[PDB]
Every structure is written in structure tokens, then in C-alpha cells.
């Protein structure tokens, strides 16, 4: 089978790309009703509900004990389908112990929702799209009207189903169907109330859990105009007309051992467009089906024609692990009836399997169905990465672990819980819980974390002579953060849970609902398929080179952690400094750094034997890897939203990390090979590979540049001056890159990542380092502080230089900024390809009616030195301008002498020859 992959969304990163979070209450009177307990029951999601309509927009709903929640995760193209905020609706009691209480339907540019509390009431809330867009706190209307249409006391509801903005249907255990009409200050109601229960035969063996053989299991709704579909407890297929409020059609499906199987929640039926499908598990066989009915509505009466038998399952669920159908949705390609695709979610406890079935038929009564598989498992990277913190590449101890929790970047409030649970010192919850709710702000969180951690681990002295035992601080800290993060993993071995799936017409994307963790479905990328090391599977799936790739991946996995630490530090040192040396001798030097790890000469020679046996390595490697470059289209963007940027951030951290893996692999091999027998290496029987080596190292610089870049979330709205420009006005990092690189027959996400990855791959064609471009633009808006270590990293280029300058300026460490300014110049002016900084120098050049070689630049630097308010360096540079002028323009010379006059006014005085002899 082919595979599938997931893309997980941390709720805190949502809360990042969502500036504010507002909380609404509703009239509450009559409503019916220790640390680890409250922590477990703190968060979950009793059910999950996601809707979207034909018009425009899209949101997701999270449920909660005594609490309702909702946020904006849409991928649209409007004026403001990007500026977002999060909504918390408080309730007198929870939204039922069961899956009910959810419904969403719209009307006109608004969202209308129908709810049910634990006991016996309805809720009707109308929320404006503008309400969603605005950061504003205020509402000026009656957003909600609670009501009890029929007596829910008599017949408790087990199923709710909207049909329109005014009307909504409810289904009871007894089997009756009520319809509820609402209106401002109005409510009129309808029914098809049915009560279903010889009497001797009902005297004995009568005792059972309450049932009613006219109950309906799950209803579904499809509008051609107004049509419903129903499955009853009699297991009859009933079809419902809204106008009539009566059963238009009935079909008898005869299975006796089928109603014997009863499931909580679960959607027994769903739909594509006009047609609809559903299926029955047939119990332990786990056969299930697809009975995609075609409903041919005729003028006399709407007609029903089911057209298909049964659809087989996959068989990985076993070991008595209860497979459970969580939800499914049916979606076909509206382009042409060539294929139909069903999305299916299975869950067993916390664990989850997800799969899609694609049926390609036309005339065949046969069954042509491609299946996809997914795997959800936990691999603990914990226990071993803990021991060695000896090198200062990432020194100390604590900071590293923190960066581990940030490296995961997939679990959220579990952390908060743990933090303010460890700080208690046998303190309670009821008050400390509110203390958990209070903090909110993320940047300070980590500070509170460390402050709490150090306040818990006593440092016992060495007792030598006023000395301390760091060697105890060792185990203490390691097992501390280990136990901590183990309680963390346990708070998402209790939390990481799935419940529903909901497809969207406007976006055509494979949505997914996990408990408190939204996610996405995507096809395997090449890198993924080759990182699975499916050597045996690839075999099971002009043919050479791949075994080297897999075995090699194993070779990389052979190395230790401190090893990769040293390696990362060394390459970090190979970003800026390496081009200074003679380029192709460092090759053997890298393997000379590779002997320090284990690297048994047995393994070495074992590989060498493979190498000498190679037919023609380079001519296959360079080409077959060159074929890996993707196809980007258009690269033009509409006004992009926020789920775009953050989700792409997470998924790209995954892909980029696997890239760093595969690349590091590649190099490590390339010099583990061409080490010994140096003379034979230079014999040129092999094609040699130094050039493509260099190219690959460019690639690595970029890849690990991003790998770093997705770790600095810095933003602020001091000035708060603010489209995609408002997308930069959102907090999370790495986004700016994705917004910078945001469709004919393909989902938007995939393509808008494709353009990016393509803009990364492309080397000489762009004629520009993507790093220089990034910091060039990103500097303008925010992140002024991060681009310090970031510019200290970036490769030396004229661009990179003037940026080094302006940044070393924003930090006002004048000196080094000034050394950068001095040691370079401009041949780049009047090119305009550089963004929003060249235009200054260019306007200045044009102000002299020409294009002077140098003096103009120096002038620009004098004015800029004014912008820094530091006047003395302007005294310096205005001179250079005044001097190196090789043009002899009147206007220009006058202007320069003038600015020199101002800088002098900043520090002049009487003494003549005392401003003639002072520079640097």
C-alpha cells in the first residue's frame, strides 16, 4: 500500500497567529449539575466539530467540560481573511456528556450556531464575520436566544441536525423527529413523534438498556433543495422531505446481528454532493462497506437508487485492539465521474489510524480501489540525548532541554499544567488553577519555567573547601527535566486524541480534527519516502544508487549526539569562514574530523569494497539527485491568511530537519569514501566531485539557515502601525518566508510550499542567496534583535555587508557597523532589485543628475549617521564624500560641502586644523 502523513498544529501557535481571545457568557439560571484529577479533566474535547459553506469562510470548534471554544483556520483570499482572534464561550453546564449540541449553518455573511447543554436547553448564537475579523471587544446586539421548543425533559435528545437558518431538527431516543422554527421573539414547532416498543415475549428477557424500535441512529442532510436521509433502529432506510415533514421513502435492509453492535457518537452516513453513502461494519468481521445511493428526484416524487455492495477493510488493527470508526466523509471529483474518494478515521484509545479509499470506475461492475495507509506511533528521542552537555556549542544544561520542548513543537497546555503543578509544593488546585489561567503571555512563560526549576533543585556543595558538586547537579538536572517531560508526554498520551473529519468545498482540502490539536493530511514527499529507509519496501515497490542512499542513512544514524553537535558547530563555522581556504583540500580534512567518532576500520573497508565496485558513481548521483527539483507555478499571491503561515512553519521544520539529515548523510559519505588511496582519487578514473560538493554545501547552508530561522518567534507592536503586510503583523517566526512565497488542479498549501522549496533549490539561476534576500526584507519590519546572530551567521556579500552595517546600527554598537560601512562600497546602486533600501541611495544618486562613483555613497552614509543621532562618525564620513568626488559637479560638490557643514555644526568650534586630522 501507499502511505500518508500528518501535519500537527500546536494550539499555542494558533494563539500566536491569533492576537486576542474574547470570552462570552449567556444567561444561566436552571442548569443541572486532587491535582492530577483536575489536570486530566482540565482539557480534552468531548467532541470536535468543523464547518464551512459555499460562500467564503471557515472555522473550527473545540468542546470542553463546562466550556465551549472556537477559532479561525481558513485559507481564503479576501481583504482581511488573515487578521484573526480566538473565541471562548462559557456555559452554565457542559455541552452534554454526549456528541450532540453541535450545529453550524450560515445565511448571509454571518455564522449561526445551534447548541445543547447537559440537561434540557437549546442555544442559538449569531456571530458576524466582521466580529471574527475585528480585534475589538465590543458587540452591540442580541447575539443569542436560548429556547426550549419541545419538552426535552420528556424525550431527551440524542441527535441534532440543522436544515436552515431559522429551522432545525431534533431526534430523540423514542424515535420521534421534531422540527424547530426560531425567529427573533418567536418559535413555532413541528414533529414526527413516534413511540415504539408478545407481551408475554416482552415479560421475560425484557431487561436491557433503554431502546425504541423507531429511534434513528444517525441523520444526514443534503440539499438539492430540502432533503434528509435517515437510518432507524428498525434498521430501515427512511428518507425525509422538509416541506412535508414526512417519510418520503423507505428501504428494508435485513441484518439481525447488525443492530447488536451499538456505538457512541459516530457518523453512520455522509455525502459528496447530490449522492450520499453510508456503511455498516457487520461487527467483528470489520468488513464495513460503501452503499453510495443515487437519489434521482422526480417531479412526482423523489426517487432512491442504491448502486453498490461492499468495500473491504485494511487489516493492521488486531491484538484485540478495538478498531472504532470515528467519522468518515465521502468526496468525489466534480470534474468527471472517473473516481470517488472516501476519507475514513479509525481510533483505538489514544491511538489512531487514518485512511482514504479511491474508487476508479466507469462501466466496470468490478472494484478498482487504491488504498492509502497511515501510522501513528511514539518514538522517544528522550532518554539518550540527555547525558552529555560538555561542549558549549549548546552549553550549560537547562537551555538545551527547553530547546528540546521547543523542538518538539506539537504539545501545548500540557506544559502549562505541568509547570504550575510542580511549583505547587503540595499546594491545591482550585486557586492554583486560576493561576494557570492568568499567565497567558508566552515570552515570559519560559522565564517563569526556569525560575521555578532552579527554585526546586538544591545544589549540594562538594565539601572540599567552599566548593560545589556540579557532578550531582548533573544527574539532578537530567532526571529532573526528564521526569518533567515524561509527565509532559503523559499529558499528551492522555491528550493526543482524534474525533472527527470534515471536508471543505471552498478549499478542497483533506481536513482533520484531533482533540485540541488540529492537523492535516498530505501525500508522501520524496524525502519522506527515502527517509523511511524502505529498502526492502522499495524493492517490494538504469536502476542503481539507492541502496547506497539507504545504507548511508543507516551510517548517519550510526553516529552519536555530541558528534552531531561538533558537526553542527563546525558547519556553522563553515558558513562564513570556509571560502577563505583553498577549496578542495578541506575535503580529506573533514574525514580527518570523522575518525574521532567510532568508525571501525572494518566498517570503513566494508564500505570501500562497495565503492571500488561502483560502475560510475558521480554520473548517476549528480543527475538522479538533480531530478529532485520540484515544479513551482506562478509564484503570485493573493492576500494570505494565518493557518497558511504557521502550519507551513511546522511542516517545514519537519521537512527541513529531515533534509539536514539526508544532506549531512551525503557529505559524510562523500568524504568517508574519498579519504584513503588519495593518489588513486586524483587519478581521475572516477569523474571527481568537488564542484557538486560545493553546490551541495550551498544547499546545506540554506537548509540549516532555515532550521535555525524557525526558532526565533520575535515580534512586537510598540508603534503598532498596520493584506500580507498584516501577515507580517502576526507574531510567529519563519512565517514571513512563507508569506514571501505563497493552483490549476492542486490544493493551495502544497503548491504554496512548492514555490518556496523551488526558490530554495534554485542556485545560480536566482543569482542571489535566499538568506540575503530574507534578512534584506525582514529587517524592515521587525525581528531587529534576532537578525544580529542571524547577520553574524549570514554569508559575506555586499548586500549582507550593508545589512551587517544597518543591524550593527540598530543595536547602536557603532564601531563594528562603521567598520562594515568602511570596508565596502556600492556598485549595486540603481539596480532596484534590492528591496526598500536601494531606493534611498538611488534617489541620492539621481539628485546629482548622474551616477558618481563614490562620494555620493559616503554622503548617504553621513545622512544615515545623522539618523543614528551619533554625529561624530558623520564628521568622519562627510569628509570622505567631500574628498573622493571624481565627478566635479557644481550642485553635488555644493550639497556635500553643505552636509559637511551640518556635521561640523554637530562638533566644530574655533580651532582650524583640528578637524583635518581625525578619522577612524
Amino acid at each position: 500500500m501507499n502511505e500518508l502523513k500528518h501535519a500537527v498544529v500546536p494550539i499555542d501557535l494558533q494563539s500566536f497567529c491569533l492576537e486576542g481571545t474574547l470570552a462570552l457568557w449567556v444567561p444561566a439560571l436552571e442548569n443541572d449539575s486532587l491535582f492530577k484529577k483536575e489536570c486530566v479533566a482540565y482539557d480534552a474535547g468531548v467532541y470536535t466539530s468543523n464547518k464551512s459553506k459555499g460562500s467564503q469562510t471557515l472555522r473550527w470548534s473545540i468542546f470542553q467540560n463546562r466550556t465551549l471554544t472556537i477559532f479561525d483556520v481558513s485559507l481564503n483570499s479576501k481583504k482581511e481573511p488573515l487578521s484573526k482572534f480566538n473565541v471562548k464561550i462559557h456555559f452554565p453546564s457542559n455541552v452534554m456528556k454526549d456528541g450532540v449540541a453541535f450545529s453550524f449553518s450560515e445565511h448571509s455573511d454571518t455564522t449561526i450556531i445551534y447548541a445543547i447543554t447537559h440537561a434540557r436547553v437549546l442555544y442559538y448564537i449569531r456571530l458576524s464575520k466582521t466580529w471574527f475579523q475585528l480585534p475589538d471587544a465590543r458587540l452591540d446586539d442580541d447575539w443569542c436566544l436560548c429556547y426550549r421548543p419541545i419538552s426535552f425533559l420528556n424525550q431527551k435528545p440524542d441527535l441534532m441536525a440543522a436544515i436552515s437558518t431559522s429551522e432545525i431538527c431534533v431526534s430523540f431516543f423514542n424515535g420521534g423527529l421534531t422540527k424547530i422554527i426560531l425567529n427573533p421573539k418567536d418559535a413555532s414547532h413541528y414533529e414526527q413523534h413516534i413511540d415504539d416498543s408478545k407481551k408475554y415475549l416482552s415479560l421475560q428477557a425484557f431487561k436491557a438498556d433503554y431502546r425504541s424500535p423507531n429511534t434513528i441512529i444517525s441523520m444526514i442532510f443534503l440539499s438539492t433543495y430540502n432533503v434528509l436521509v435517515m437510518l432507524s433502529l428498525d434498521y430501515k432506510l427512511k428518507v425525509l422531505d422538509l416541506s412535508t415533514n414526512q417519510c418520503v421513502e423507505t428501504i428494508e435492509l435485513s441484518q439481525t446481528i447488525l443492530p447488536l453492535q451499538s456505538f457512541p457518537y459516530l457518523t453512520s452516513d455522509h455525502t459528496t454532493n447530490s449522492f450520499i453513502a453510508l456503511y455498516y461494519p457487520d461487527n467483528s468481521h470489520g468488513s464495513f462497506s460503501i452503499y453510495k445511493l443515487n437519489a434521482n428526484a422526480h417531479s412526482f416524487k423523489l426517487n432512491v437508487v442504491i448502486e453498490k455492495g461492499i468495500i473491504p477493510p485494511s487489516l493492521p488493527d488486531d491484538e484485540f485492539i478495538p478498531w472504532m470508526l470515528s467519522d468518515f466523509q465521502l468526496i468525489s471529483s466534480e470534474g468527471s465521474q472517473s473516481k470517488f474518494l472516501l476519507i475514513i478515521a479509525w481510533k483505538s484509545n489514544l491511538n489512531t489510524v487514518i485512511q482514504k479509499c479511491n474508487l476508479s470506475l466507469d462501466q466496470d461492475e468490478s472494484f478498482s480501489c487504491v488504498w492509502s495507509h497511515s501510522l501513528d506511533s511514539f518514538s522517544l528521542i528522550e532518554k539518550t540525548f540527555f547525558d552529555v552537555p560538555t561542549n558549549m556549542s549548546s552549553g550549560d544544561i537547562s537551555e538545551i532541554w527547553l530547546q528540546h520542548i521547543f523542538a518538539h513543537n506539537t504539545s501545548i497546555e500540557s506544559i502549562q499544567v505541568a509547570l504550575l503543578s510542580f511549583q505547587n509544593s503540595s499546594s491545591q488546585v482550585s486557586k492554583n488553577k486560576l493561576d494557570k489561567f492568568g499567565a497567558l503571555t508566552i515570552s515570559e512563560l519560559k522565564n517563569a519555567v526556569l525560575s521555578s526549576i532552579v527554585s526546586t533543585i538544591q545544589i549540594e556543595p562538594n565539601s572540599d573547601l567552599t566548593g560545589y558538586d556540579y557532578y550531582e547537579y548533573k544527574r539532578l538536572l537530567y532526571n529532573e527535566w526528564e521526569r518533567f517531560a515524561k509527565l509532559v508526554a503523559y499529558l499528551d498520551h492522555f491528550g493526543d486524541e482524534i474525533l472527527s473529519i470534515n471536508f471543505d468545498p471552498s478549499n478542497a482540502v483533506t481536513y482533520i480534527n484531533y482533540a485540541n490539536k488540529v492537523a492535516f493530511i498530505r501525500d508522501p514527499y520524496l524525502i519522506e519516502s527515502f527517509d523511511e529507509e524502505p529498502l526492502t519496501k522499495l524493492i517490494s515497490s538504469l536502476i542503481e544508487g539507492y541502496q547506497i542512499l539507504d545504507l548511508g542513512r543507516s551510517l548517519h544514524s550510526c553516529m552519536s549526539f555530541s558528534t552531531l553537535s561538533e558537526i553542527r558547530y563546525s558547519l556553522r563555522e563553515l558558513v562564513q569562514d570556509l571560502p577563505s581556504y583553498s577549496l578542495f583540500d578541506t575535503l580529506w580534512v573533514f574525514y580527518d574530523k570523522h575518525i574521532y567518532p567510532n568508525v571501525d576500520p572494518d566498517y570503513i573497508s566494508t564500505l570501500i569494497d562497495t565503492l571500488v565496485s561502483l560502475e560510475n558513481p558521480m554520473r548517476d548521483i549528480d543527475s538522479l539527485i538533480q531530478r529532485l527539483r520540484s515544479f513551482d507555478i506562478y509564484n503570485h499571491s493573493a492576500q494570505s491568511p494565518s493557518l497558511f503561515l504557521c502550519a507551513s512553519v511546522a511542516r517545514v521544520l519537519d521537512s527541513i530537519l529531515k533534509k539536514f539529515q539526508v544532506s549531512i548523510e551525503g557529505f559524510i559519505f562523500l568524504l568517508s569514501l574519498i579519504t584513503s588511496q588519495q593518489d588513486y582519487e586524483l587519478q581521475s578514473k572516477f569523474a571527481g566531485c568537488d564542484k557538486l560538493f560545493l553546490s551541495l554545501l550551498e544547499d546545506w547552508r540554506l537548509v540549516s539557515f532555515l532550521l535555525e530561522n524557525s526558532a526565533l518567534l520575535l515580534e512586537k507592536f510598540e508603534e503598532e502601525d498596520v493584506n500580507t503586510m498584516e501577515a507580517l503583523a502576526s507574531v510567529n517566526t519563519a512565517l514571513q518566508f512563507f508569506s514571501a512565497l505563497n493552483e490549476s488542479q492542486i490544493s493551495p498549501l502544497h503548491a504554496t510550499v512548492i514555490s518556496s522549496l523551488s526558490a530554495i533549490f534554485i542556485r545560480d539561476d536566482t543569482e542571489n542567496d535566499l538568506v540575503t534576500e530574507l534578512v534584506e526584507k525582514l529587517f524592515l519590519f521587525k525581528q531587529y534583535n534576532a537578525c544580529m546572530q542571524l547577520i553574524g551567521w549570514l554569508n559575506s556579500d555586499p548586500i549582507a555587508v550593508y545589512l551587517k552595517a544597518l543591524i550593527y546600527l540598530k543595536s547602536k554598537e557603532a564601531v563594528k557597523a562603521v567598520r562594515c560601512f568602511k570596508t565596502t562600497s556600492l556598485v549595486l546602486y540603481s539596480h532596484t532589485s534590492q528591496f526598500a533600501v536601494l531606493r534611498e541611495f538611488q534617489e541620492i544618486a539621481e539628485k546629482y543628475h548622474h551616477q558618481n562613483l563614490l562620494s555620493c555613497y559616503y554622503l548617504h552614509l553621513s545622512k544615515k549617521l545623522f539618523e543614528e543621532s551619533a554625529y561624530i562618525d558623520a564628521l568622519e564620513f562627510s569628509l570622505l564624500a567631500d574628498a573622493s568626488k571624481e565627478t566635479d559637479d557644481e550642485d553635488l560638490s555644493i550639497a556635500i560641502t553643505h552636509e559637511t557643514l551640518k556635521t561640523a555644526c554637530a562638533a566644530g568650534k574655533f580651532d582650524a586644523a583640528h578637524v583635518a586630522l581625525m578619522v577612524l
Partner: protein, 354 residues
Amino acid sequence: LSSNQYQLPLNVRPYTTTWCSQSPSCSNLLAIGHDTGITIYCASEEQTPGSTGLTLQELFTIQTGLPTLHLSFSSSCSYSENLSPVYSLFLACVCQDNTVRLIITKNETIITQHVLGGKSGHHNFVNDIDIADVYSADNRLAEQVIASVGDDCTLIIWRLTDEGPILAGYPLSSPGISVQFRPSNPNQLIVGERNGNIRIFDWTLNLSAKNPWLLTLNTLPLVNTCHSSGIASSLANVRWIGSDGSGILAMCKSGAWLRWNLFGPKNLLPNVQGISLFPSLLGACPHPRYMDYFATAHSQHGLIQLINTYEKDSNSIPIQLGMPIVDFCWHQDGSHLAIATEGSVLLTRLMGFT
């Protein structure tokens, strides 16, 4: 108060200043690192008025021909007479060419110079430097040790021994912005990375043939947060305090300061914390005699706040100039202050510390 101002030559643009507190025999020596060299002054008790009973006399100018950013005297500095007198100076500094130099002089005549630069030295700009003399058990001059930290994310330990030079390079998780050996214990030193890490480090741990450098504190997460220190609170300075090196004082660019103490029992937090009125781009300059006291500067507007760690301060700003302050440092006596601005050097006496 009483200030005495002494003009640097008008063509001399200052970059740093420092007292020779590291050596008692030349403690009246004041150095000015400028764009062409290093200028030496001497502090002396005139009769004056007993207000600022101390004046500066310009001794001489050592030309080097290139900018001196940072400057440090060694304990090897000495004074002699032939009756005419001769000063024997040892100066560690940083030049425009990103090199780290040790210049040894007899007065204004430069007699010896060692240079550490290029690829062997720092691979970027050098931010801070400090020097210490290490003697053997027999007590001859065994080694002169110069330590430097850089924007190449590197701490470089430089040893100048009887049998020659010993170079050592070490990585940092971020640019090194400050560095200083521990008083009364040259075996240890402290390192100041940009990101807020503070390194306690034993450089004698490896000889001939297992342990890391020693300890790491951090200020960024310890910020009191009662008043947010802002988004970017870049570490500006870290300095030892006490004559036995019994304390540590850290200062951010924001003005937030923290103190730890080093002796008894077990410890769980920074001993004290606080915040300056103004940013401290230059960091703090601890008082040589009162451990509770240090000075910080609003270098752009020309003010200097004096801070007491146990809050005896209550905001004391004894110094207010009308011009930017380029650098400063405490005279050994602890009552006088030496301050270098873009064209001058002031010696000010605060009557309260005499």
C-alpha cells in the same frame, strides 16, 4: 560637587579608558585608547582645594597608528628612576584589523609587540579582552595570559610563556560580549555571551594524557517581570565583585541588574535583583572598595547613575554631563571617577566616599 576637565588633543577621538587598578605600583596611571594609539596620564594630589584633591597630569602618548577599542593593563607594569624616570608598560588591546595585540613599552617607545589575528585569531569582530599574570610555585613570571571573546562565537585563551606561545580556542553558544578573570584566583574566569549566558570557567583543566568548563548562569529568564524588561534585553556586561572574587554582577542593555554571591548552604535563585533608570550600553563598573556599589551610564545623554545592591541607593545620580559619555572607570581610591567623552576626560570627586 567638583569636577576637573582635561582635554585630549582635539584630533584624538577616544574609544576606551581604564585605570591600572590591576597593579598598585602604577595605580595612578590612566590610559586612553584612540584612533592612533594609547595615551598615558598620571593622577596626583595637588594641594588643590580639598574638594577634588586630585589632578591629572598628561604624561605621554604612545602612537600605534590605528584605533584602540579596548584596553587592559597587566600587573607587570612598573616604574623606575635614573637620577630621567622610566615607565615599563604592558598593554593588551584590540585594533582595526580585528587583531588582538600585546604591546610592551618603555614609556612612549614601543619595545615589543605580539599580534594574534587573521584565521588563527578571531574570525570576526572582537568585543572584549582581559589580562592576568600567572606565576609558578617558585614565583618567577611563568605565563602572561590574555583572554578574548568574539562575534565569531568563540572564547580564545592566549598564553605567553617562557618557552613561547600557547593558543587555545573554545566555542560559545553565542557571540562573546564580555570577559574577566576572577580576582585572587587566576585559575578561573567568567565569560559573557550575547544571548544572556554567563560562563564560569577553569582553563587549567587539561594538560597531558575530562571535565566541562564549570558553571553556567543566565539572566534572561531571571528577569523579575514585575516590570517587563522589554523584548530585547541583550546582556551588556558581567563582572566579578570582591577581592576574593566572592560575587557576580550582571547587567543588561535594558538596565536590569542581578547579583549572585560566592562563598555556605545550598542556593536556588539569584541573591538580589534590580533595575537601572536608563539603558546601560557600556554595562556596569563595580566600585573597587564598596561591594554594594556600582555605576551605570546613559551614554547617549551623558548621565551616570550610582546603584547600591541592597537598595541603600534610592537613585543617586552624582554625575550629569551635557554631552555623550564614551567610557568610564573608578580610580582605586574609590571616591574619584574617570570619564572619557568624545573630546575630553573628566576627573570628578564624590565627597560621600572619602
